[PDB]
Structures are given as C-alpha cells and as structure tokens.
Amino acid sequence: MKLYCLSGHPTLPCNVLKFKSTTIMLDCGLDMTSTLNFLPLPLVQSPRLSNLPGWSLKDGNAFLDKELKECSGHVFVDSVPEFCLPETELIDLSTVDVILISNYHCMMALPYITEHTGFTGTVYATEPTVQIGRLLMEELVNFIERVPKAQSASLWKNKDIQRLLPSPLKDAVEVSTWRRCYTMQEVNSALSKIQLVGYSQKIELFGAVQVTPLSSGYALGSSNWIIQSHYEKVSYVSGSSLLTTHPQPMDQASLKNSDVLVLTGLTQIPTANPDGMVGEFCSNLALTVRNGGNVLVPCYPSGVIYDLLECLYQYIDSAGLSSVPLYFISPVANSSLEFSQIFAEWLCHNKQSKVYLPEPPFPHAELIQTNKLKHYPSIHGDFSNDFRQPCVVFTGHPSLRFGDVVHFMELWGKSSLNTVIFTEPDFSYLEALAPYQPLAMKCIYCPIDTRLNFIQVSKLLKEVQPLHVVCPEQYTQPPPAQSHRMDLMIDCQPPAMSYRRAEVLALPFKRRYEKIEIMPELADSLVPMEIKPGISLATVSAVLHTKDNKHLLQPPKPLLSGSIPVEQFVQTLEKHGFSDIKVEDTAKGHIVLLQEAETLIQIEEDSTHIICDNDEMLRVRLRDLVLKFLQKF
Amino acid sequence: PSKSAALHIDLCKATSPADALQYLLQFARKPVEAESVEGVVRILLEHYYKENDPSVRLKIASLLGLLSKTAGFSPDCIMDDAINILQNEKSHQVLAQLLDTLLAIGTKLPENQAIQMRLVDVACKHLTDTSHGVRNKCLQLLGNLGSLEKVQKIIGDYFSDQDPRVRTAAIKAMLQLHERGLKLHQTIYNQACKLLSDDYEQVRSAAVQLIWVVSQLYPESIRLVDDAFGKICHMVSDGSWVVRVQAAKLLGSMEQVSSHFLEQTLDKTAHERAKELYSGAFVHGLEDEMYEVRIAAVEALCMLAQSSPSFAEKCLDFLVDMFNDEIEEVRLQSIHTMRKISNNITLREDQLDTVLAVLEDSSRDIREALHELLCCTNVSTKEGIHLALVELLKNLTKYPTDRDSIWKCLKFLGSRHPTLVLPLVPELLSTHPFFDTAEPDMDDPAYIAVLVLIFNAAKTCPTMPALFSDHTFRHYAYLRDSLSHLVPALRLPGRKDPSQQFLQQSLERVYSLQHLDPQGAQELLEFTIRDLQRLGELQSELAGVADFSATYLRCQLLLIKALQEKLWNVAAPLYLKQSDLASAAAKQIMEETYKMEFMYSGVENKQVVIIHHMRLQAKALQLIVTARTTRGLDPLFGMCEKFLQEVDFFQRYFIADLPHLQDSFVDKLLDLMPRLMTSKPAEVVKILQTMLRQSAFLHLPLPEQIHKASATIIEPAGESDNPLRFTSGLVVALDVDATLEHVQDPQNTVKVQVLYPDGQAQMIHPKPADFRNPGPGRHRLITQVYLSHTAWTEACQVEVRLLLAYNEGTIPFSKPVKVYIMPKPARR
C-alpha cells in the first residue's frame, strides 16, 4: 500500500491512499494561511485602510509601492485574498477514484478538485458534514464576493521578490499555486456530485474494498474512516473528541485491530484547558458587560458556537445580564440554527433523550423564544434598526481577514472599553490582529479546542495497538513554542514515520492472502485427508469464476510428495500377486529386482528410479502403485 | 538553457523523493517551455528516467505530456515514448503514466495515419495489461485513435471482461467511435442487451446510451426499436435516479416508434371516468420520483409528441392532471410542453381545470405561462369560449397588473378562431333589443378586454358591424387610435437618405471653407455645431455620428479660440492672470478627446489616429501655455523632452497613415524633428507656436452607424423626501438599477461612484454577475452599494453617479442622483 500526502498542514489534509486496484483519497484542506497574509476586505472602505502607506522595494525596481502596503512597521499584500491549495500534480486526480470526507472543514476545498481537475468518480460524506459544508462554502463565497476587489499582484509572487521580502512573506510557502475563490455553479456542481452515507454503513467498492464511517465526535457528523479488505485494515482517524461533547461519542471498537492507522487532526494548543478557558471567557464577558461596552467574538457557525451559547445561557442566568442582547450575524445563521436543530440522531444520548421528551436538543431555540439572542443575515437593514449598546456580537468569519468581523472592529477600534474575544485556534492571533495595530480594543486570547491532546493520543494508541502509525512531521517534532517539553511529541512503539508536504510513503506491508469462496457441491466432493496431527488437507481441482473482483470456485496438475518404503513395497507386491522379487541393500538405498519385465528399482533418500523394458500395462500398473503409495500435493 | 540548468541541478542534488519532486513541481508550475527546447528537455528527462522512484518517473512522464500539450514535439518524442513503453514495464503507475503520455502525443497535434496513430494503437493492443493496469486507458486510447472507416473483437471481449470500470471505459470508447462514426453493428446490440443486464451501477447508465445509439442507427432485428424501447422502459422503472434521468432524456431523443407500442407504454382511470361523465412506462415514470425525472419525462414527452401527430390526447390528460406537481419548475415545464404540443388539439372538458390553474396566488411566471398557453391553444365550443372569457375576466379583476398579457392573449384567441364568438355578441355586451343602452366606460380594463377580442374576431367575419352599437363605433376609433398593435384595421362605415446627405454636405462645407478668416471660422463652427446638435436630437440612428462630429467641431473651435486669445498679442513676460481660456481650453480639449475615444462604441483606427493627433495638439497647446507662464529653463527643458518623447511614441505606434496625413501638424513636425533635437527649447516653443497657428485642419472620416453609450439610473428615483435612516457606523445597502445602452466591456468599464457629502469619493466595482444582458448591446446593471458614515445632525444628500473608466482615467456619462441619508446615534 502507498500513501501520498499533499498537505503539510497538520489539520487540513489530503491523503491519496493506493490500495489493491483502487485509489481512495481522504479530505480536502483549504489553508487560509495565505488569507492571513493578504490584506483585509472592508465592507465599506475605511479611511485608514484606504491611505495605508505603500512599502517599497529597497532596490526600487519593482512596483511594490502599489503592489504592497505597510502598516505599523509590518507589510501585507494588497489584492483579493488567496487560498493555498494542496499540490494536485503529484498524482492525477482523474486516476484517483473515490473520495472520502471526514468533516466540513475538511471538505472546504472540494470545488477546486472536483471541477477543474477532471476527477469523475464518487465522493462520500455524512449528511451533517455535507450540509454544514454547503453553508460554509456559501458564507465563504459570499464574503469573498459581496464587494469585488478584483486587484491582483504577481511581481510579489515572483520568487526573487519573495526571497527579498521579510518574514512572514519570506516564510510564505508555495505561493505559485495559490488561487482565487470559486463560485456558485462550482459549489452546486460539487454538491450534486456528492453522495450520502450514515454511520456504520458498509459501502462496497467494486468488491475490492469496503468503507465505513465512525463518529469521531469533534463536530456534528465529523467522522473517522475505516477501509478494509478481508485481511487488511486501515483506520484513518482525523479530528476526534473523546471528551463529553454534543455529537455522538467516539467509537474505538471497530477502530482497534488495525494494520495501518493514519492519525491527523490533533489539537493546535495542547496546553489549553477547554472548560477552564470557557469559564474565563464567561468571566471576561461579564466584566466587559458590567463595564458597559461591546464584545466581538468571531466564530464558525457550528460546534464551538453551540457549546459557547449553552455556557453563556447558564452564565447569563447566573449573572443576571438579561438586559444586554446577543446578536449572531452571518448570512448562514438561520439555516445553521435550523440544521443544528433537526440534526438529532447524530447527537449524544442526553440530547437524544431531550428530543424524546418533546423539547429541542439545543437551548438556543429557547433563547430565541426568550428573545435574548437574535440572528441576522447581514448588518445592513433591520439589524441597523435594532442595534444596541452595550452588546454581544458573534460574527461570521474567524480568520478576521474579511467580513462583518472586520467592519465591526474598524468601527470599534478607536474605543478601548470594548473587547474582542478569540475562540477558534486555527490561526495565530498575532498575525490575525497585525493589520489593525495599534488597537485600543482589549484583546483576550482564550482559544477553545476539543481535539484530543497527546496524553489521550498515547492512551488511545495503547488501547488499540496498531501495526503501523502514520503522523505528520510537525507531530513527530517538538513545537517551537515549547521544545523543552517532552509530552508535546507523539510517542509510539514502533515510532511512526513522518511526512512533509507533497511526500510519498510506501507503508510496511506485503499483500499475501485475499478472500475466495468455495461452492457447496465442490466442498461436498472434496475429501480432506491427514498426514499430521491437527492437519488435514485435500488437493483441489476446480474452475475459477471471478465477477467484480470477487472470486469463487466450481468443479469443471498436482505432483508427488513422500518417500515409499521398500519393505511395504515388496510385501504389497507379494500380497497383490507379484512374486520372485529380490531386495539388496546399499549405503543409503535399496535395489529391488522384479523378474517379470526385468524391472530394477533403486530407492534412496528423496530419490526413486524405476528401469524396465518396453512394457506398457505393467508400467501403468507400477505407475498407479507408486503414485498411490504416497500423499498427493 | 533553463532546461539544461534544471537537469544539472537535479543531477547535482539527487535526493530520492525530495529534490526530484521539488524539481518536477517547479518545472511544471513555473511555465511552459514555449520553444523548441521541449525536445531537449524531453531527451534529458528520458536520460534521467533510467533510475529508481517510479513515482518520480510517472511525474516526469506527466511533465513530458504537459510539455507535449504545447504541440512543439511530434515524431521524435513519439519514438522515444514508444521505446520507453517497450522497455519500461514497471507496475501500474508507470504503465498509467505511459498511457497518458501516449494519449497526449496521439491527440496533441498530428491526428494522422502512417505510424502517427496506428503504431500507437498496435502498441496498446500488444501492451494490454493483466489487472487494471492500462486496460481502461488503452481502451480510451483506441477510442481516440480509432483506425479507419473500414477492434470489434477486442472491444467485445472487453465488454465481458472483469472490471466494471474497464467496461465503462470501453463504453466511453464506444461513444467516441460513434461520434467519429465507425458504423457499429447488430452484434453490438446483442452484447449491449447483455450489458444492460449487468447487475451493477453506471455500467447500465452508459450501456443504455449505447443501446439507444444502435437502435437509432438502424431498426432491423426481427422489431428492433420497439424491443429497445421496451428495454428502455423496463430500465426506467429502475430505482437509480441518475439512470432514470439518463433514460428519460435518451428515450426522448428517440423519435420514431410503433404508435401502438407507444399507447401500450401509456396504458394502465379517472380520466376516462370523467370523460364518460362528460359524455406502464410513463404512468410510473412521471409520478415515480421527484423533479429531475419529472422534467426529463416531460421533455421526452414533448419531443415525441411533436414527432407523433397522434397520441397527444392521452398525454393531454396526463399533463392537465399533472399541473399541480408542487415543484414550480415542473409546473412551468408542464405548461411549456402543453404549448409546444397544442396543435390539432381540443380541450372540450379540460378547460375548467386548466383555467382553475390560471387562477393562482402570485406565481407571476405561472400565470404568464398560462396566458401564453391560452393564446396558443385551440378550443371547439362556444360555451368553452364563454367560460374562458368569464374566468379570464376573473383573473383580470383579481390581479390588475398583467392586463397587457390578458389583452394580447384575447387578441390571439380572436385571431385564431373568429367564428366561435358570433352568438355571444348580443350577450357579452349588453345591447337590450329596443332600449338605448347606457354608454360603456371607455378605459375600463374589462370592457377593453372584451372589445379587443371582438375586433380580432371581426377581422375576418363581416357580419357584425350591423350588430355593433354607436358607442362600439367610436370605441373602435379610440382603440385603433390608442392600442395600435392590439386591434387590427377594419372596414367600419365610420372609419374608412436626406439626413445622411445633409450631414455629409455640411461637413464637406466646413472642410472646404477652412481657408478663411479666424473670425469667420468661429461663426461657421458655432453654426454647424448647433446644427448637428439639432440633427442629433432630430433623428435617432444618426444621433451618435452627429454628436461625434459635433463634439469634434467643438474641439476644433475650442483650439482656434485658444489660439486667437489676446495673450499672444500681449508681450511674453507679463502673463497676468485669469486670461487662461487657453489653459481651460487645453483641459477641456484633452477631456473631450478622451471622451471621444472611449465613450463611443464604433471607432476604427483611422478615427483613433485622428484622435491621437488631436491629443498631441492639445499637449502642444498646454506646453505653449506653460512655456508662457514658466520662468525655469530646466522645467521648460523637461516639458520639451517629455513632449518630444510623446511625439516619438506617436510616430512609433502609428508608423502607418503618415501618407494619409497630408500637410499635417504632426507629419510636418516629424519632418522638422531633428532641428528640434538640436535647438534650445525657447525657439522650439516659438516655432511650435507659429507651426500650430498655421498648421492644418484634418478630415474626420465618418464611419457607419455607431452609437454613444448612455447610462440612466432608473432606481433609486431620488425624488423621495423620506430619508433613509440608520444607526451610526452601521451600513445601509442601497440597490442601484441602471440601464446601459451601447457599451463594450461593461463589467470592466462601468463603475459606480458615490460622493459622500463630507466630500469623499468611493469607487464601487460591480461583480460581473450584476450585468444582465437581455438583448443585443443593451445591458442592465443591478447591484448593491454599501453606504456608511458617522452620525449626522440632519438628513443629507449623497450623490450616486456612473463613471466609465478606461485603460487610466474616468469619464462621467450619467445623470447624478441624490439620495437622502441620515444616521442616528446609538440608542443606549
């Protein structure tokens, strides 16, 4: 089996696995690291971002004064934001056959692969995954749109200028394959190419393989995959959460007893205590509200938002802050709430029982009923009619480089009393908040993570004991933040081979057996026979019939094994009718003479030889005799 | 060069996966070779291929195919690829890469015989793999390199071989062979039946396309097309909906069939129960699954119903009951197919529910489609006409907006069949047999709706002017006066290129009368300017060319006034102030030349080089004025250098048309150019001054019927004193709806400009989905403009205008609109 890893990102993978006669690729990363590097897109053009000064080449040859701009001693690129792609040219994705999805964050990059490249096979994902993915791509395409900034620069994308530029523009990787954003017809094309699957569903591919998804528990419908043939097992685990969360809990029973385990989607901040930082969030939120300002929280419309609103529901009941309202602003807000509402069977047992006792599983429907939390699609209109101060706003995009988030903190940047709270760990908040610096806004960084830490990784691997482990180089290596700490690296016996962006591995396995079926009449015909205690064997003579890579045998040249004894030979010749047979002995063999047809036979250790005259019927009699005095293989 | 350096770098590095993948990715992603060095790069790649890492070898083969996609190489690369395929039997990845390279070489450029495709086909046939290695790829190789119009044995075996993927690839090759022709046979029909029975997905989906194509090839088995059609229907009842959509579209593409077999498909009913009261293919395929197979079914039905003159009634009922299909796409497609089949068609009972259909909530598309259906339909009975009228009047009095479509469909009804309405004429309009009936209302829409039907009926039959009353006489006069395209001409007793030549004559008058006094030139120019402006108002198709020549004459008059300014009479060192009508003239003349270049639609390079001549003349006049006002000899030197540089740019760009310019400013200056290189700028501008004073006037060749662009904002109206209210810092979205007329490159040229009353301009670009194109050269811009600012004390007026940018500068060509904006402060 062979593995091609097309993403150096630890969280956003593309893994092309070649097994037997099929090709199965997993996940789709759309790295917004280049998005972090590009300039933000104001919904309404702010004067300061309009007149940001232009950083200049020290040589002065290139037109980087208008290709690039500078702010607070730091430099950014001025265009529409780009997105980093996985390297598609390592393997022809047309020859790549079947695509699996873990979760919506891992399906963000799907129209790129599914429209332009020429892939034409089938794609699998669960229902909540595919629906929340459609909502996310709708939000993303809207925000790259809704104001077209068609400017694009390329002389900075020249390699020499990239070398001359300072970090992190010096630290930019694979600038050449960065692309502009995709559109609704592309979205609909991929989302019609999709097919559906539930948990523990066995999907057969060509008889060659069978795939099953299991609840990882990180997100609503987030799923680890299991690919098996009848002797071979690959467990692909990406982004599980074994803590008590809202989705279905993680299921390791089918995960164990695996030949090859690939592990991705681990935590980004290992030292983060989730519930503790959630409590710190609530305390800081109460402090800002009591001070009388406005709080911003950028968040994806799944997962962490639901957990945050539940805890804020309990905390607002605790602190008695029913005066200050909550506004959830995103063009996907209404459909996100409704989809989280009806997706019930994918939840955990507490929420399923909540469904079974006629109430909605999430409390934010009751929050809407009590009118504390109001959802709004865009900031223009009735939201502008109903805005309040002091206030709470959960805004659409967490990467901060486009949307209602950037407009709101352009509005609120001058004030100090207001507060921004980061809640998603997928980006460095320093490089996120660099363009607005200097900033009077209070910034409190309390990231929320549910991906399993290395202690739980060690526990899970010691529970399941796979034969081979595959993990990223960033998980093998110590982090630059705390290289002194030892528990921050994955430990496994045997040590897992690593991989880098666009790398090829050949996994340590050799294909030996596969699954074939016998047919009952042929099994009736076959009679086993025993040469060794506990070993009974039978020679076979059949016709193979193989349709759709599944194999069966039906009735329509074996050789010998075993030495023949001379004493039993002559005894059975005498009792069969042969007479006047004389035996002489040698150093290792016996020479036996039969006077009829003048037959001389020498018997040695793994050596027998019969010499006679031109005779036929005696020869074939001796043929059947010597062949029936041995075991057939 | 670069390829040799890359090969040397790869050989020097020689890392196993790392440098190989990095070099391959860099060479692929950087650029195409775009030269003949692709062969040398391929030779270096073939030399480096004799190594390990078959994955890197496959990547190199893909890079070779990508390089061959530029069609630089042919036979040498073909021979090298043949050698590599013969000597490189190393597993599935390298086999697939070789197959892909072979396909790229075959389909890249040659497309010829004589070992350009036949040798590759023989090589693929000999190198067919053992287990999924090349089989699919070599099948599509032979598909795209089909030999001649003389492979059938091997494709027959590859139909019955192991893998469904290989089967589907063979079937795709069959698509390719049929679209190249190749005249398939009936053994393909038999094996296509046994491929229809294949127990597996998508193999069926493409194999049934093959059974369709052989059936439409020829109908000779025993009945071949009827057997194929029955197989198609028994395949339509499969569960797989993609298969069903494919099935329905392909059976609709089928056009000839046994008629009795078609009614056997429609055979099973409350339709015939209702018919007596008045007096399984499609019947599962319509209400089997949702709107995909439903739309495919109705398109199939419309195509074969347009084919068959019979058969329509047994789908007439199956459409009239399947209006209310709870999917509006299915609704609209049902109405459209009823229109397209509505010929030799009676609706003796179905009028009631098909008009309960046009009674409908909002559904503006549905109601319009039903009006089209009623205008293009036929009816048989006078009672049906009567009830069609009464519920049509129900519709008009219930939704008084689509009365225009109501009147036009009543018109088409009267024109379609006039004789049905004749007994209703006393009844539909009250004409009490001896009384003086009171005069009906004139502009009452119901009465208009009945009158237009009456007149369209009376087009042919003459036996009802006597039936008319006197109010009907004067109302026919008024309706014929008003709605010219709705009522026709009748026989009632009461109602029984000079412009182009003139434009040419005036222009040649100016051109001939060029050689006279500057004053008389001024009055002649003014007179002809207002003349051509009057003509541009007067006509429409000459308006663009008239305004274009008019603004050119305005240009010339402006320059002549700038020359005749008294600044030249007054001595040089003074240049007092405010007499710089010359400078204002220079700015206006430059702006008019830009406008004259870009805002107009049809311009050709003769006009363009005339424009650039005039722009050079403008820059010369501006240079003269700045020379008059400027004391610095080095600023004079700089301006002179830049001006002569631009003259050099002009002549370099327009090498041509120098014979076309006779006695021209620019060509005489090009003759005197080296002396300008020698001489000091003072005498340069002196000679330039006199030179342009008695330079010339060029002719402007008038082109064909060109137009000038015109932008009109129809929304927002801007007369509203009700302000648009919001809270401070928040944004309000304001829709902009404008009509653009005669604009090229609209999504890149038309940009919105908003002036905020604190004085700042915000330039908003529209996304290219906002430019709808309903017709030829006439576009609609529908967009959002996002307005925000801090709070204001009162309402103010924000300006919205449409700017046109070129490539460099912007030109307004729209009337500005004022929108009242008022932001409130925060509520708490």
Concatenated DSSP letters for A467-531? Answer: SEEE--HHHHSPPSS-SS-STTS---SSPPB---SSEEEE-S-------EE--HHHHHH---EEE
Count of C-beta atoms within a 10 Å radius of residue B613? 21
Residue A362, marked binder: no
Query: Is the minimum CB–CB distance between B81 and chain A shorter than 8 Å?
Result: no
Q: Which residue of chain B comes nearest to A18, CA vs CA?
A: B93
Q: Please tell me the distance from the alpha carbon of residue A390 to that of residue A323, in angstroms, as a whole number.
A: 9
Q: Which DSSP category does B420 fall into?
A: G
State whether the Cα torsion B141-B144-B149-B153 is positive or negative. positive
Strand order, beta sheet including A516-517: A516-517, A550-554, A543-547
Write the single-letter amino acid at A240. Answer: S
- Helical packing angle, B498-512 and B543-564, nearest 10°: 20
Q: Which DSSP category does B814 fall into?
A: B
**Per-residue tokens: A223:** 């799923």
C-alpha dihedral over A207, A208, A212, A216, to 10 degrees? -170
Q: How far apart are the first and last CA of chain A?
A: 32
How far is CA A152 from each of CA A26, A260, B319, B804, B805, rounded to the nearest angstrom?
32, 44, 53, 21, 18
Q: Do A145 and B767 touch (CB under 8 A)?
A: yes
Write the single-letter amino acid at A84. Answer: C
Residues of chain A contacting residue B726, judged by C-beta atoms under 8 Å apart: 384-385
List, as own/partner pairs, every contact residues B318-322 make where C-beta atoms lie below 8 angstroms and the sequence separation is at least 24, other chains included: B318/B266, B318/B271, B318/B282, B318/B283, B318/B286, B320/B347, B320/B350, B320/B353, B320/B354, B321/B271, B321/B353, B322/B286, B322/B287
Q: Which stretches within B483-580 are classed as H helix? A: 498-512, 518-538, 543-564
Count of C-beta atoms within a 10 Å radius of residue B93? 20
Q: Do B21 and A546 touch (CB under 8 A)?
A: no
Q: Please tell me the distance from the alpha carbon of residue A398 to that of residue A308, in angstroms, as a whole number.
A: 14
**Main-chain dihedrals φ then ψ at residue B224, nearest 5 degrees:** -65, -50
Q: Which residue of chain B comes nearest to A178, CA vs CA?
A: B29
Candidates A149, A504, A548; nearest CB to B164: A548
State CA A155 to chain mean position distance: 36
Residue A284 sits in a domain whose CATH number is: 3.40.50.10890
Resolution (A): 4.6
Q: Please tell me the distance from the alpha carbon of residue A253 to that of residue A251, in angstroms, as a whole number.
A: 6
**Looking at the DSSP assignment, which residues form a beta bridge with residue A240?**
A217
Q: Please tell me the distance from the alpha carbon of residue A55 to that of residue A569, in angstroms, as a whole number.
A: 102
Candidates A146, A384, A502; nearest CB to B730: A384
Residues 6+ apart with CB under 8 A from A41: A80, A81, A143, A144, A147, A149, A401, A402, A403, A406
Q: Do B827 and A549 touch (CB under 8 A)?
A: no
Query: Is the minimum CB–CB distance between B96 and chain A shorter than 8 Å?
Result: yes
Q: What is the 3-state secondary structure (H, E, C) of A388-414?
A: CCCEEEEECCCCCCECHHHHHHHHHCC
Query: Is the minimum CB–CB distance between B762 and chain A shorter than 8 Å?
Result: yes
Q: Please tell me the distance from the alpha carbon of residue B33 to that of residue B68, in angstroms, as a whole number.
A: 10
E strands, A258-390, in order? 260-264, 294-298, 326-329, 373-376
Q: Please tell me the distance from the alpha carbon of residue B639 to that of residue A406, in angstroms, as a whole number.
A: 46
Closest of B237, B243, B235 to residue B284, by C-alpha: B237
Residue A157, marked binder: no
**Per-residue tokens: B451:** 């009158």
List, as own/partner pairs, every contact residues B399-406 make where C-beta atoms lie below 8 angstroms and the sequence separation is at least 24, other chains included: B399/B367, B400/B445, B402/B364, B402/B367, B402/B368, B402/B371, B403/B445, B403/B449, B405/B368, B405/B371, B405/B372, B406/B371, B406/B449
Angle at B335 between CA B330 and CA B336, to 5 degrees: 95
Residues of chain B contacting residue A383, judged by C-beta atoms under 8 Å apart: 730
CA Rg value for chain B:
39
How far is CA B284 from each of CA A469, A604, B101, B724, rounded to the nearest angstrom?
53, 80, 48, 56
The three-state secondary structure class of A283 is helix
The three-state secondary structure class of B805 is strand
**Looking at the DSSP assignment, which residues form a beta bridge with residue A601?**
A592, A610
Q: Which stretches within A194-320 are classed as H helix? A: 274-291, 304-319
Q: What does chain B come to in residues?
A: 828
**Per-residue tokens: B46:** 């073939």
**Inter-chain CB pairs, A–B, below 8 Å:** 87
Q: Please tell me the distance from the alpha carbon of residue B512 to that of residue B134, in angstroms, as a whole number.
A: 80
Q: Please tell me the distance from the alpha carbon of residue B163 to that of residue B169, in angstroms, as a whole number.
A: 10
CA Rg value for chain A:
35
Write the single-letter amino acid at B119. Answer: L
Strand order, beta sheet including A194-195: A194-195, A123-124, A98-100, A22-26, A15-19, A2-5, A503-506
Q: Please tell me the distance from the alpha carbon of residue B269 to that of residue B261, in angstroms, as a whole number.
A: 19
**Per-residue tokens: B47:** 């030399």
How far is CA B64 from each of CA A502, B7, B33, B68, B71, rounded to the nearest angstrom?
20, 14, 11, 6, 11
- Helical packing angle, B186-196 and B152-159, nearest 10°: 10
Question: What is the greatest pairwise CA distance in chain B?
Answer: 115
Residue environment code for B790-816, b if the CB has 16+ CB neighbours within 10 A, otherwise e: eebeeebebebbbbbbeeeebbebbee
Experimental method of this PDB entry? cryo-EM
Note if the bond before A533 is cis, omega within 30 degrees.
Answer: no
Residue A19, marked binder: yes
Q: What does chain A come to in residues?
A: 633
Q: How far is B139 from chain A (nearest CA, A)?
A: 15
Q: Please tell me the distance from the alpha carbon of residue A537 to that of residue A518, in angstroms, as a whole number.
A: 15
**Looking at the DSSP assignment, which residues form a beta bridge with residue A608?**
A603
Closest of A284, A336, A343 to residue A305, by C-alpha: A336
H or E element at residue A419? strand A419-422
Do residues B7 and B23 touch, judged by C-beta distance below 8 A? no
Do residues A548 and B200 touch, judged by C-beta distance below 8 A? yes
Count of C-beta atoms within a 10 Å radius of residue B589? 23
Candidates B62, B164, B765; nearest CB to A148: B765
Residues of chain B contacting residue A45, judged by C-beta atoms under 8 Å apart: 762
Q: Do B727 and A384 touch (CB under 8 A)?
A: yes
Q: Please tell me the distance from the alpha carbon of residue B489 to that of residue B478, in angstroms, as a whole number.
A: 12
Q: Do A380 and B733 touch (CB under 8 A)?
A: yes
H or E element at residue A134? helix A127-144
Residues of chain B contacting residue A148, judged by C-beta atoms under 8 Å apart: 765-768
Do residues A544 and A609 touch, judged by C-beta distance below 8 A? no
Do residues B652 and B644 touch, judged by C-beta distance below 8 A? no
Closest of B497, B608, B489, B490 to residue B548, by C-alpha: B608
Q: Please tell me the distance from the alpha carbon of residue A132 to that of residue A152, in angstroms, as a whole number.
A: 30
Candidates A21, A148, A383; nearest CB to B767: A148
**What range does the domain containing A415 cover?**
274-445
**Looking at the DSSP assignment, which residues form a beta bridge with residue B593?**
none
Do residues B801 and B814 touch, judged by C-beta distance below 8 A? yes
Q: Do B826 and A546 touch (CB under 8 A)?
A: no
C-alpha dihedral over B68, B72, B77, B81, to 10 degrees? 10
Q: Which residue of chain A comes nearest to B30, CA vs CA?
A: A176
Residue A510, marked binder: yes
Q: Please identify among residues 388-417 of chain A the ones whose CB lies closer than 8 Å to any CB of chain B.
A: 388-390, 407, 411
Residues of chain A contacting residue B132, judged by C-beta atoms under 8 Å apart: 21
The three-state secondary structure class of B373 is helix
Q: Please tell me the distance from the alpha carbon of residue B735 to that of residue B715, in angstroms, as a whole number.
A: 7
Query: Is the minimum CB–CB distance between A292 and chain B shorter than 8 Å?
Result: no
State CA B590 to chain mean position distance: 34
Chain breaks in chain A (C to N over 2.5 A) after: 556
Write the single-letter amino acid at B118. Answer: R
Q: Please tell me the distance from the alpha carbon of residue A632 to that of residue B397, in angstroms, as a whole number.
A: 98
Residues of chain A contacting residue B784, judged by C-beta atoms under 8 Å apart: 146
Q: Please identify among residues 58-87 of chain A the ones whose CB lies closer than 8 Å to any CB of chain B.
A: 87
Write the single-letter amino acid at A601. Answer: I
Q: Do B826 and A547 touch (CB under 8 A)?
A: no
Residues 6+ apart with CB under 8 A from B509: B528
Closest of B763, B772, B776 to residue B803, by C-alpha: B763
**Per-residue tokens: B69:** 């996609």
Chain breaks in chain B (C to N over 2.5 A) after: 150, 222, 268, 279, 496, 807
Interstrand relation of A550-554 and A516-517 (parallel, antiparallel or unpaired): parallel
Q: Please tell me the distance from the alpha carbon of residue B214 to that of residue B198, in angstroms, as a whole number.
A: 18
How far is CA B127 from each of CA A95, A280, A615, B468, B528, rounded to the nearest angstrom?
19, 68, 49, 89, 82
Q: Which residue of chain B comes nearest to A293, CA vs CA?
A: B828
Q: Do B25 and A502 touch (CB under 8 A)?
A: yes
